Each structure stands twice: as C-alpha cells, then as structure tokens.
C-alpha cells in the first residue's frame, strides 16, 4: 500500500549510463534519484490512496438547476412544471473531470436539493409543498400539462419529496447500451448515400451517437395554487460510484463551447513569462 523505499547509493564510475536515453522510442526513462545522485536509505510511508479513481470521483457535483412555480395556471407566465434533459454537459467541472478518459463504466447517485421562496408580500400565506420528480425514459409519453394523465407514474420511477426534509437520494446502475460510456464519439448516426434524393436525408450531427440518450426528468409541485405565487428551484448532484476508466486523454485547455469539442472564444490559456526568469 505504501510507496517503494529509497535505496542507498554510492559513487559510480561505470560503462552503463542510465542518464542518457532516447525519447524517440516513445518511452519514459524510468529513473530514480539513486541513479543520478548519492542517496540515503529512507523507509517510505507516503501512499497514493487519495489519487485512486474512486477517491478522485468520490464527490457530488451540481449539474442542473430546475425552476418551477406554484400559481394559478392562467394568471402569470406559466412555467409551473419543468422537464430537464439528463446530461452532465450543462456544467464544466464534472465534465472536465470525466473527460480525462475516453471510456468509463460506473454506477451513479443522484441527490436533490430543493429551496423555495415567496414573490409577493400581499398575503404571505402558503402551506408546505410536495415535489414530484418523474423519470421519463426515451419513447415514453411526456407530460404536456402539470396535471395530465402522464403523472400517474404507473411504470416510470418517481420521487415524492416533501419540502423541509432531508435531500432526496437514489442510485442508478450502469444503464449504457454498450459495454462502457463513450465520452467521445468520432462518427455520425446517419451516412448519406449516392442514391439519396437529396443531401438533407442523410444529414446528422457530428459526434452525436444518439438523440434522447437518457431521457428527461419532469418536476412539478403536487400542491394546488395558493393565493400567492411561490417559486422554487431544484439542484441535482451526481456522484459516480464503482468507477472504471480507460484510455486517458489530455484535459480541456480552453473554454467549452457546446456539447462537442468546439472552441471559439479565448484559445490563449498560457500567460507571459521570460525565458530566463525564475
């Protein structure tokens, strides 16, 4: 579990030269301090337990902020039920952490933090609210009103969270179609053919394996409308668990631009510094 010790070394005068190498071979010279300078025996007790993949990814990171309202459905701007597209690309921190690798395979844990506030001081009357969060896999009917039949959740998983309680939480297994999630996909979903009537038939988005990759989460307030509008927001935190990764990649160096690998704005990450300045 601990790192290897340091071996004592003495003066060297030999025909074997570990200092010289040739990076052209594509290999890293696996030297140790004892191969270039004299060293003493040191029992090593430092460990790499904090650098493991589990430890690296064992954190919950915000990925979305969903806003819903509780008001009469014909009084103001009606946005009293939302529907969020499940994706980790809405933020930058977790996306950059994940994009160190090409493929990954992990379970996931969702945690929901809900906060509410008033908007008018005329009454100040409102009772405790209950929130419904329904998962709608691709192809399932999507609600088109806050109280239509789709909310019966006959087979869709759904969470009923009462305001003021501990944050809701659930776990999801590896639900990928392939044997590992593909953070990067160098291909298309459709291929145009010479026999196609027009070019737009085979058109597709570059680096987009599928549409509706994981579905949406529908959020509403079960309570009817109080005399005053009440606004609330839902924050979603994702923690990968039991993580395996493959094929490391360089990390992102310039600001993200869209769900692809595009870059527009800055393209100048490094700062100025003299060549011979400490």
């Amino acid at each position: 579990d601990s790192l290897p010790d340091t071996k004592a070394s003495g003066p060297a005068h030999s025909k074997e030269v570990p200092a010289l190498t040739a990076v052209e071979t594509g290999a890293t010279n696996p030297l140790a301090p004892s191969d270039t300078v004299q060293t003493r025996h040191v029992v090593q007790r430092r460990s790499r337990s904090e650098s493991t993949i589990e430890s690296f990814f064992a954190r919950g990171a915000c990925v979305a902020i969903i806003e819903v309202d509780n008001e009469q459905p014909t009084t103001r701007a009606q946005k009293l039920f939302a529907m969020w597209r499940i994706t980790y690309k809405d933020t930058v921190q977790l996306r950059r952490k994940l994009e160190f690798f090409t493929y990954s395979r992990f379970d996931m844990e969702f945690t929901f933090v809900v906060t509410a506030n008033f908007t008018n001081a005329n009454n100040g009357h409102a009772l405790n609210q209950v929130y419904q969060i329904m998962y709608i896999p691709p192809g399932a009917p999507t609600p088109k009103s806050w109280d239509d039949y789709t909310w019966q959740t006959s087979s869709n998983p759904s969470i009923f969270y009462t305001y003021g309680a501990a944050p809701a939480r659930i776990s999801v297994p590896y639900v990928g179609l392939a044997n590992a999630y593909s953070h990067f996909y160098d291909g298309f979903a459709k291929v145009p053919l010479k026999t196609d009537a027009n070019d737009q038939i085979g058109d597709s988005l570059y680096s987009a394996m599928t549409v509706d990759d994981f579905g949406v989460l529908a959020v509403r307030v079960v309570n009817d409308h109080n005399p005053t509008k009440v606004t609330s927001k839902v924050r979603i935190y994702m923690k990968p668990k039991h993580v395996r990764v493959w094929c490391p990649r360089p990390p992102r160096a310039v600001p993200y631009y869209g769900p692809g690998v595009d870059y527009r704005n800055n393209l100048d990450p490094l700062s100025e510094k003299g060549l011979t300045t400490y």
Epitope: I66, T74, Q78, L80, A82, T142, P143, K144, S145, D212
Partner: antibody, heavy 127, light 110 residues
Framework: EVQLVQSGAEVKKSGESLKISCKAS????????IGWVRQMPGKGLEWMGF????????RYGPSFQGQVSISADKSSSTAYLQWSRLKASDTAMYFC????????????????????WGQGTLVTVSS | NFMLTQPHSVSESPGKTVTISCTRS????????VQWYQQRPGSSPTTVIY?????PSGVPDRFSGSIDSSSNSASLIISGLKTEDEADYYC?????????FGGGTKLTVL
Amino acid sequence: EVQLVQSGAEVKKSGESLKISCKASGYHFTSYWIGWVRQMPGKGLEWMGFIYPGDSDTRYGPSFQGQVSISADKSSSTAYLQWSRLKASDTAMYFCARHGGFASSLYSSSFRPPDYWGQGTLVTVSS
Amino acid sequence: NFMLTQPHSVSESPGKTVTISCTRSSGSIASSYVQWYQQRPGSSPTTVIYEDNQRPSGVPDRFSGSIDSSSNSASLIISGLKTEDEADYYCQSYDSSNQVFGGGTKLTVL
C-alpha cells in the same frame, strides 16, 4: 364562436404612426398570450411580439427596436399593434394569433403556439 | 441563428401523394414540436398540424404529420391530392421562447 376579428386594410403615409386592433369574441380576451405575425408580399411569415397584459411584454423585432409596440385592453377584449414611424419596408399583411391555453411548462413541452388566427390586416398606400 | 429549410416546390395532379418536408437547424428537435400552416391564395393562415401528433378541428384525415428524430426533419404526407389543396404550406416551431417560421413550400395540383 372562438375567433379573432381584425380591422380591414389600413392606410397611412410614411413617417406617421399606425395602430390596428384585434378583438376576441366568445371568451375572456386575456386568458392567454397574444402574438402578432407579419407577412410581406410573397415572403414567409415573421415574428413581431408575444404580449400579455400582466407585464405588456412588447418584444420587438431585432431590426425594429421600438418602432413596433403592442398592448392589450381588458375592457374592450382587444389587443392593439402600433407603429411609431412607418417606412416603405413595413408594407405587409399582419395577423393576430392566440392559443386556447394548456400552457404550463417552463420549457417547450407546454409553452404552446397559437391555434386560432385573425383574418389579417393589410398596410399599404393606395396608388 | 437558425432556420427551417423546406423543399423548393411540388407540382402534381389530382389523386397523387406527396410528402412535404421541413428540416430544423437548431435546438433539440425532440424537445420542441414543429407545426404546419396552410395559406390558400388570398387567404389567412390556418393551423393544420402541431405537437407532431395532434390535429386541429376541420382538418380532413388526408393530412398527417410525422417526424424523423435522427435527421431533425418533419414531414407532412397528403394522400389522394385534390385540386383544392392548392396553397402555400409553412412549417412553424416554438423552440423555448419564440416562434420561427419556415421558408414556405408551393404545392401545385392540376
């Protein structure tokens, strides 16, 4: 019946302010939003605004900031489209629209488009 | 920002069948729903299709809407064309906050 009635063709000289109205029948006018759509001769339709008396959101056209304005009147169950300074490029056919309702979403799912239209109004200068 | 391209134009004869297309160019196609509007010569626009699966009052079943998620294209199929189908057809959308109209397709029936 659930219908929107506009005024017939309207004529004004260049540089003046014009105002046209769209009146609803058979229901309360301000149940939901009112949208105004323009169609220049031989071209596709275009957006002008989507307004509602709660805040009178006069969402102008990108190239017509301020020139085009919209408002609603609860007493007469009518909405009005107003131009501040007419130009030769404002010669078009204007339609007022409205959706029966059903809109409850923060996002595209149920923030709906109109399903009933007016007969349209024409803005020209006779010649 | 984005457009709703349409096919140039179609000229047919009564009893034919056509499929008018409309290709979206931005926003997730599966999120917002495309529509269709018919404007007969010298007439106001009318609503014929929206939500991708709901049809308004007074529309004969001869007109049906359909979508292709992968290609971001919406289709309108007319089976058994009629001489009274002579009109312009526009595909309309509502992405998240505003409506964007298409370029318009002219259909001719002899």
